[PDB]
């Protein structure tokens, strides 16, 4: 029906918790973002980067997970016959323990995660120090310098040709020293992506906005997507928040369904319209209820598991400084028209 099945009424707390955690909702914002990302993935048409900006806890990683899952059925029937090809690969940037970013570690991690399809397939990277041990784990020597690892990764990426290269938590690329420029790092990434011809999708918070519109090249070369939250200043976002609260309420595995619609205000206070934060709060309070053995949900358990005031303050400050740079107004359109002379 519109909620959890009644059979789950005779199970343990673990089954209810697992069902709720493995439950992802499709709000209209997520639907539009998923559709345009899928369309972009189908035909990037000379796009090197797809930056994914959004507030921490809006649903970037789940969207990426669903994208790779979809790519895995649009490929599997075509992967029955073809081989030596992966549908999609992913990686998360490492925050360096030193003052500067470790590009060699990025290359090694990318080579490790890319090359494990099957022991049967073999391919010579052309770099001395890279092999596969008896356990089937791709091993790289400690002396293979960064350019050699880059060449090996280039060869592997050309051979494997994934439909996209996902780089989550991309803002960690910005951990550089004084003289180092962000344009240099993004230019190295662009050179890699263009030479292997593999589309790169960078996902992260609004700090990744420091990697936006740096040069005219890095700029053209880019489809910027925005995972915006729900804002209380518009009726449609408020109504959608209420509707997602209602569907969550009907999909909370409890004998009695709590009334979360009336308590939306405080909700929006601690969640900032981000569905991921709302879901983690709801799953935490459900675990609390199933440990205490409570049939329904009350406000006290909601206040025992909500975020702190200062945390939400800093989150909203970052979110404001982010949305301030990702808004389109007719004044900017006319300014560009006048600068070009089209007006």
């Amino acid at each position: 029906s519109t909620g959890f099945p009644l059979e789950l009424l005779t199970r343990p707390a673990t089954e209810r918790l697992a069902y709720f955690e493995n439950y992802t909702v499709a709000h209209p914002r997520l639907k539009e973002v998923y559709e345009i990302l899928m369309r972009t993935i189908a035909e990037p048409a000379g796009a090197s980067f797809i930056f994914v900006y959004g507030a921490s806890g809006v649903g970037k990683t789940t969207l990426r997970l669903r994208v790779e899952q979809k790519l895995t059925e649009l490929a599997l029937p075509k992967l029955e016959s073809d081989r030596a090809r992966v549908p999609v690969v992913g990686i998360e940037a490492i925050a360096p323990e030193s003052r500067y970013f470790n590009w060699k570690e990025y290359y090694t991690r990318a080579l490790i995660t890319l090359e494990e399809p099957l022991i049967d397939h073999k391919f010579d990277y052309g770099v001395r120090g890279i092999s596969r041990d008896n356990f089937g784990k791709i091993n790289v020597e400690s002396k293979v310098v960064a350019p050699a690892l880059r060449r090996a990764l280039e060869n592997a990426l050309i051979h494997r040709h994934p439909d996209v290269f996902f780089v989550d938590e991309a803002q960690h690329f910005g951990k550089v020293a004084s003289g180092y420029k962000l344009q240099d790092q993004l230019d190295c990434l662009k050179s890699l992506a263009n030479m292997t011809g593999i589309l790169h999708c960078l996902l992260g918070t609004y700090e990744l906005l420091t990697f936006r519109n740096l040069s005219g090249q890095l700029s053209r070369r880019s489809v910027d997507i925005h995972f915006r939250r729900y804002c209380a200043d518009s009726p449609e976002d408020v109504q959608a928040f209420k509707s997602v609260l209602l569907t969550f309420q009907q999909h909370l595995p409890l004998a009695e369904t709590p009334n979360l619609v009336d308590h939306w205000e405080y909700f929006y206070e601690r969640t900032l319209g981000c569905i991921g934060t709302l879901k983690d709060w709801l799953k935490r309070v459900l675990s609390d209820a199933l440990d205490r053995e409570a049939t329904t949900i009350t406000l006290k358990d909601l206040q025992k598991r909500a975020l702190s005031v200062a945390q939400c303050q800093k989150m909203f400050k970052e979110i404001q400084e982010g949305e301030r740079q990702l808004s389109e107004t007719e004044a900017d359109v006319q300014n560009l028209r006048s600068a070009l002379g089209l007006g």
Binding site: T24, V25, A26, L30, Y34, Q239, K242, S243, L246
Partner: peptide, 8 residues
């Protein structure tokens, strides 16, 4: 009227 969404 409150809408009910589906599973992603």
């Amino acid at each position: 009227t409150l809408v009910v969404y589906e599973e992603f």
